[PDB]
Amino acid sequence: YTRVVWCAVGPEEQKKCQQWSQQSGQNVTCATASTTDDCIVLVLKGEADALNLDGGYIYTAGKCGLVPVLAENRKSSKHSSLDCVLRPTEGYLAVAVVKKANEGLTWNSLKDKKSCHTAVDRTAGWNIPMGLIVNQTGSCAFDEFFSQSCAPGADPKSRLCALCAGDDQGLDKCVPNSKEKYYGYTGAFRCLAEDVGDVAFVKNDTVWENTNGESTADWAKNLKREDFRLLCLDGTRKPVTEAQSCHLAVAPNHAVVSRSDRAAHVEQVLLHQQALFGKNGKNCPDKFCLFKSETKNLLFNDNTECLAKLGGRPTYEEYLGTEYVTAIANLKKCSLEACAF
């Protein structure tokens, strides 16, 4: 058989990947790159096999010929009798989150406010909110909309990176990897929690997972759900319990992608690796947990119960959904079928 070469984005993911590799008996090994796009390029070159991607990155990867293999499946209600690996995914809720204390901030007064984004090109953090904003403002100048932002992956000298903080030393400001303090779901929510931004573009789960003691992290320790609100598209504000009626979109779950020629083997290896290291995994938590990273969502989201089989052997467009694909396409006209590499 062959080994599977995972691609880790940044040095923290690399550390986790190297643990996984050690525990896997080298069935999985690790390549690393600085950005998700660079990992995609490694995969395209055949120098890595696979990584797990947000839907916006799935679009990039898809255009370049990479295919979805398995999807993250979090806890559900529905389809409650089937195994996680066979339970249909549900998709996560992209939300706009503000402080309750920031009274009178709504969707319609976001202009010239400070924003926190997971990263450029990600679903909840970018594609959905900026796609909506471009459409409603009828302008492609999404780079001049918020007074300041943290939008990892944007030009570090620009207003879209002005709120980003980098790493301990204050290097890597605005890089789109976990070295950036305000990267990703948990980083963007932290940017809001610390009042660096006025609004965070994250998902519903992020808010719950980092409040009311669900996170023991210093910046999250003491956060309370009731101190946050969601911005609905109709201009109202709701408690974070109302995400099902106050979201920006429903997003397709992050999913593993590979070259088509390696998909079957990546799939088999992953199904076995999560049997060992997944949620009820034979050797998790004693040895290693693939879906834990102390809240940092490294390699996979920490709320992943399993990687689930896809159904209909879907193309990247089918997996993302035609509506989301066209929304992305429309947005990218601002910055039209390619491989961008």
Ligand X SMILES: OC[C@H]1O[C@H](O[C@H]2[C@H](O)[C@@H](O)[C@H](O)O[C@@H]2CO)[C@H](O)[C@@H](O)[C@@H]1O
Ligand Y SMILES: *[C@@H]1O[C@H](CO)[C@@H](O[C@@H]2O[C@H](CO)[C@@H](O[C@H]3O[C@H](CO[C@@H]4O[C@H](CO)[C@@H](O)[C@H](O)[C@@H]4O)[C@@H](OC4O[C@H](CO)[C@@H](O)[C@H](O)[C@@H]4O)[C@H](O)[C@@H]3O)[C@H](O)[C@H]2NC(C)=O)[C@H](O)[C@H]1NC(C)=O
Ligand Z SMILES: *[C@@H]1O[C@H](CO)[C@@H](O[C@@H]2O[C@H](CO)[C@@H](O[C@@H]3O[C@H](CO)[C@@H](O[C@@H]4O[C@H](CO)[C@@H](O[C@@H]5O[C@H](CO)[C@@H](O[C@@H]6O[C@H](CO)[C@@H](O)[C@H](O)[C@@H]6O)[C@H](O)[C@@H]5O)[C@H](O)[C@@H]4O)[C@H](O)[C@@H]3O)[C@H](O)[C@H]2NC(C)=O)[C@H](O)[C@H]1NC(C)=O
Ligand U SMILES: *[C@@H]1O[C@H](CO)[C@@H](O[C@@H]2O[C@H](CO)[C@@H](O)[C@H](O)[C@H]2NC(C)=O)[C@H](O)[C@H]1NC(C)=O
Task: Judge whether 92 is annotated as a binding position.
Answer: yes
Question: Rounded to whole angstroms, how far apart are CA atoms 158 and 150?
Answer: 10
Which whole-number Å values give the CA distances from 81 to 77, 78, 136, in the listed order? 10, 9, 42
Instruction: Report 237-276 residues binding ligand U (CB under 6 A).
Output: 272, 276
Amino acid sitting at position 129 = P
Identify the residue among 14, 21, 24, 149 touching ligand U (CB under 6 A): 24
From the list Fe ion, Zn ion, ligand X, none, pick the one residue 54 interacts with, judged by a Cβ distance below 5 to 8 Å according to partner type: Fe ion
Say whether residue 234 binds ligand Y (CB under 6 A). no
Q: Which stretch binds ligand U (CB under 6 A): 23-31, 40-48, 310-318, 329-337?
A: 23-31
Task: Judge whether 340 is annotated as a binding position.
Answer: no
Say whether residue 314 binds ligand X (CB under 6 A). yes
**Interruptions in the chain after residues (C–N over 2.5 Å):** 335
Helix (H, G, I), strand (E, B) or coil at 9: strand
Task: Judge whether 122 is annotated as a binding position.
Answer: yes
Question: Rounded to whole angstroms, how far apart are CA atoms 54 and 31?
Answer: 19
Nearer Cβ to ligand Y (24/118) = 118
Nearer Cβ to ligand Z (2/77) = 77
From the list ligand X, ligand Y, ligand U, none, pick the one residue 1 interacts with, judged by a Cβ distance below 5 to 8 Å according to partner type: ligand U
Nearer Cβ to Fe ion (54/267) = 54
Q: What is the DSSP letter of 246?
A: S
Q: Are residues 151 and 271 in contact, defined by beta-carbon separation less than 8 angstroms?
A: no
Task: Judge whether 118 is annotated as a binding position.
Answer: yes
Interface residue list for Fe ion (CB under 5 A): 54, 123
If DSSP states are collapsed to H, E and C, what string results for 258-299? ECHHHHHHHHHHHHHHHHHHCCCCCCCCCCCCCCCCCCCCCC
From the list Fe ion, ligand Z, ligand U, none, pick the one residue 186 interacts with, judged by a Cβ distance below 5 to 8 Å according to partner type: none
Identify the residue among 103, 226, 227, 323 touching ligand Y (CB under 6 A): 323
Task: Judge whether 138 is annotated as a binding position.
Answer: no
Say whether residue 1 binds ligand U (CB under 6 A). yes
20-43 exposure pattern, b = at least 16 Cβ within 10 A, e = fewer = bbebbeebbbbbbbebbbbbbbbb
From the list Fe ion, ligand X, Zn ion, none, pick the one residue 64 interacts with, judged by a Cβ distance below 5 to 8 Å according to partner type: none
From the list ligand Z, ligand X, Fe ion, none, pick the one residue 294 interacts with, judged by a Cβ distance below 5 to 8 Å according to partner type: none
Taking every pair of Cα atoms in the chain, the longest distance, rounded to a whole number of angstroms, is 60
Identify the residue among 299, 324, 328, 331 touching ligand X (CB under 6 A): 324
Nearer Cβ to Zn ion (156/314) = 314
Amino acid sitting at position 282 = K
Identify the residue among 26, 108, 109, 135 touching ligand Y (CB under 6 A): 135
Q: Are residues 180 and 160 in contact, defined by beta-carbon separation less than 8 angstroms?
A: no
Question: Rounded to whole angstroms, how far apart are CA atoms 49 and 61?
Answer: 13
Residues annotated in the binding site for Fe(3+), as ranges? 54, 92, 185, 254
Q: Site residues (CB under 6 A) for ligand Y? A: 128, 131-132, 135, 322-323, 326-327, 330
Q: Site residues (CB under 6 A) for ligand X? A: 91, 252, 314, 318-324
